[PDB]
Amino acid sequence: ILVCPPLRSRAYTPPEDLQSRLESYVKEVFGSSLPSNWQDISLEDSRLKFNLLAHLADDLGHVVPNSRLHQMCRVRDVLDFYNVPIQDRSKFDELSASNLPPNLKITWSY
Amino acid sequence: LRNRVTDRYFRIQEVLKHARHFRGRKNRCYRLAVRTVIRAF
Amino acid sequence: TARGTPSRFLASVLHNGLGRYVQQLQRLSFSVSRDGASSRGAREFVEREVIDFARRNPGVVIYVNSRPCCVPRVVAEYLNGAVREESIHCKSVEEISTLVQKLADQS
Amino acid sequence: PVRRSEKPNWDYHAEIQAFGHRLQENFSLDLLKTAFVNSCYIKSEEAKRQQLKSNQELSEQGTSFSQTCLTQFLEDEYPDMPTEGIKNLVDFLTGEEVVCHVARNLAVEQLTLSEEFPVPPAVLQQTFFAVIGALLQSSGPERTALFIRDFLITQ
Amino acid sequence: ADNFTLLGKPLLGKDLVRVEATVIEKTESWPRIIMRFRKRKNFKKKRIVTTPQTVLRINSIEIAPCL
Amino acid sequence: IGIRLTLPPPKVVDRWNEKRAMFGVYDNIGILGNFEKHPKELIRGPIWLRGWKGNELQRCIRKRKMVGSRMFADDLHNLNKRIRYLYKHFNRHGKFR
């Protein structure tokens, strides 16, 4: 019998040193000799793309979806995607966390 | 006998609630009532 | 028809507007559903417009009840003990805003 | 008839805040709560616990200010009426029917903590004058005199 | 007022008289029936309207010495 | 009074039956199976209505032509009368000529 690890959340804050971890990761996958504009290295090679995106997903806990895998053409696009923050919260919690005036009361009978 | 009418009571009740304050059989019989609510309007 | 309906004279609640104007709307109860396609517009109203309305009307208490229902509704309770229940079923956000502001303006 | 507290959609603190805001008066929250809680409610809850501050100070302060304030307005507007009539007009304005009508249409009855529903007229009058006393303690004599002028000279 | 009145031709002066009103209600009328019927021609039309309405309270009427 | 005084018994429906969960399966068998099979012969029903629509008169003619031999006597007589009536109506009556 195999035990299920607990369900992960989708809340993702981008780390402050995202640039330096991306520098590290592109150094282990794409090699030591950098082109000076490291932004515009293509991800047309699917093996290198898998290595980079799998390393980033395994480390940062956030994976690019299949609807955006074709859009991640460059490491600049990868950096943009990992800079975009997403949040996981029930929207009863969203409406409560929004600054409610003292005459507005919300009940959640669900 | 598929697709029969089931809210005919409520249609009749609309016309009769406009016909309620009348005199005679025209406040309760739908035919005589609907011939008089039209004239009232 | 006037002859088959009640009638009344022009009046205010408590000589309203003489010394000061008091908003006669007291409570608004919003029965909305989470998964109702009929309640979609009410859901958008709760997302966007109910906070600004509640800030613009500090004298009105707005309760929002998210519970499973087929017809989303609003109950307007007025200071003279009046109750007015309206269906917001399959209404868009601007129609719901117009209706709620109408309820606020009513006595 | 069942009181609005036992009716489903209710929250007392929000109702108190909206009462103050729709009356456009900067009430003190604790003073308004003590102006709405009555002694019969205390005795009933004591019996229920068997199975805090009343209205009385705020009620007497509000009643005394109401008498003095209404007497001053009436004898300034109408200097040629004598004392018996001025007193009786003040008694009409502070009487049971007028004060209970004003309190009911200002939703004092919904916010009144008592033992019996509907609220007895003496209890409603005492609670209304306790609200007047709380306003006198919170805002000042000129502002609560404007309040008295509005909600009783309009009657 | 009592003992005197003033007549404009056709309107009085704004320096002479003011009227002050207060918007106190914005409501709608009770539903009004508009119904058309012509006999032996199958002519029958029904419409419901609710005209908007505004209740104003006239607070004060003030006159000024300008005659 | 033609209206129920009590609520009807609740009509619970299971959306995940064999039939509901597998409706539409193999309906692309021709375009996904080298055209060996046709949806018209996936259709199950009367033998005279498999991959053929028709109107009422055409349905009656097709039924009499296909299964008229092995048909009951009064049912055959009714079908013949229906064909005669439908011929007369469709060929002689109507607004548009």
Give the 3-state DSSP-derived string for chain E, with helices as H, strands as E and coil as C. CCCCCCCCCCCCCCCCEEEEEEEEEEEECCCEEEEEEECCCCEEEEEEECCEEEEEEEEEEEECCCC
d(CA E43, CA A21): 80
| Burial class of A72 by CB neighbour count within 10 A (0 to 12, 13 to 18, 19+) | buried
d(CA D30, CA D36): 10
Helix (H) or strand (E) holding C53: helix C50-56
Q: CB of F62 within 8 A of CB of F70?
A: no
Pairing of strands C61-66, C25-32: parallel
| Burial class of F52 by CB neighbour count within 10 A (0 to 12, 13 to 18, 19+) | exposed
How distant, in Å, are the alpha carbons of A14, D60, D101 from that of D55?
A: 57, 8, 20
Q: Chain-centre distance of CA A16, in angstroms?
A: 13
Chain D contact set for C61 (CB, 8 A): 11, 14-15, 18
Q: CB of D30 within 8 A of CB of D136?
A: no
d(CA A105, CA A92): 11
DSSP per-residue codes, F4-33 = -SSPPPP----TTSHHHHTTTTTTTHHHHT
Q: Is the peptide bond before D121 cis (omega within 30 degrees of 0)?
A: no
Residue of chain A minimizing CA distance to D11:
A105
The three-state DSSP-derived secondary structure of chain A is CCCCCCCCCCCECCCCCHHHHHHHHHHHHHCCCCCCCHHHCECCCHHHHHHHHHHHHHHHCCCCCHHHHCCCCEHHHHHHHHHCCECCCCHHHHHHHCCCCCCEEEEECC
Q: How many CA atoms lie within 13 A of D137 on its CB side?
A: 21
Q: Is A31 on the interface with D (CB under 8 A)?
A: no
d(CA F25, CA F7): 37
Q: Tell me how many domains chain D contains.
A: 1
CB within 8 A of B4, min separation 6: which ones?
A: none
Q: Which of E22, E26, E33 sits opposite C21 (nearest CB)?
A: E22
Pairing of strands E43-49, A104-108: unpaired
d(CA C76, CA C72): 14
Specify the 3-state DSSP secondary structure of D125. helix
Cβ contact, residue pair F1, B6, below 8 Å: no
Q: CB of B22 within 8 A of CB of F14?
A: no
- Do chains F and A touch, with touching meaning 3 or more CB–CB pairs less than 8 Å apart? no
d(CA A77, CA A75): 5
CB within 8 A of C64, min separation 6: which ones?
A: A104, A105, A106, A107, C30, C32, C46, C50
Class of CATH domain C1-107: alpha beta
Q: Which of C1, C102, C105 sits opposite E33 (nearest CB)?
A: C1
d(CA D107, CA C61): 13
Find the largest Cα–Cα distance for chain C. 47
A86 has which bridge partners?
A: A12
d(CA C106, CA F56): 61
d(CA D78, CA D91): 16
The terminus-to-terminus CA distance of chain D in angstroms comes to 27
Cβ contact, residue pair E57, C16, below 8 Å: yes
CA angle at A6 for the pair A4 and A9, rounded to the nearest 5°: 140
Residues in chain D, total: 155
Q: Residue B4 has which token pair?
A: 């029969």
- Do chains A and B touch, with touching meaning 3 or more CB–CB pairs less than 8 Å apart? no
Query: Packing angle between helix C93-105 and helix C40-48, nearest 10 degrees?
Result: 70
d(CA A73, CA F65): 66
d(CA A21, CA A27): 10
CA angle at A67 for the pair A61 and A73, rounded to the nearest 5°: 85
Q: CB of C16 within 8 A of CB of C23?
A: no
Q: Is A105 on the interface with D (CB under 8 A)?
A: yes
Chain D contact set for A100 (CB, 8 A): none
Q: Chain-centre distance of CA F85, in angstroms?
A: 21
**In D, residues 30-59, which contact C (CB 8 Å cutoff)?**
none
Q: CB of D112 within 8 A of CB of D127?
A: yes
Pairing of strands E17-28, E52-63: antiparallel
Neighbours of C48 (CB within 10 A): 11
Q: Is B29 on the interface with E (CB under 8 A)?
A: no
Cβ contact, residue pair A105, D11, below 8 Å: yes
Q: Is the peptide bond before D118 cis (omega within 30 degrees of 0)?
A: yes
Find the largest Cα–Cα distance for chain F. 61
Chains that touch B (3 or more CB pairs under 8 A): C, E, F
Task: Give the closest-approach CA distance of A69 to chain D in angstroms.
Answer: 49
The domain of D131 spans 5-155
Nearest to E26 by CA among C17, C101, C76: C101
Cβ contact, residue pair C62, A107, below 8 Å: no
Chain E contact set for C10 (CB, 8 A): 55
Neighbours of A99 (CB within 10 A): 7
Q: CB of D86 within 8 A of CB of D71?
A: yes
Q: Is D2 on the interface with C (CB under 8 A)?
A: no
Q: Is D24 on the interface with C (CB under 8 A)?
A: yes
Q: How many CA atoms lie within 13 A of C21 on its CB side?
A: 15
Specify the 3-state DSSP secondary structure of C75. strand
**DSSP code at position F35:** T
Q: Residue A55 has which token pair?
A: 């390393």
- Do chains A and C touch, with touching meaning 3 or more CB–CB pairs less than 8 Å apart? yes
Q: CB of C46 within 8 A of CB of C30?
A: yes
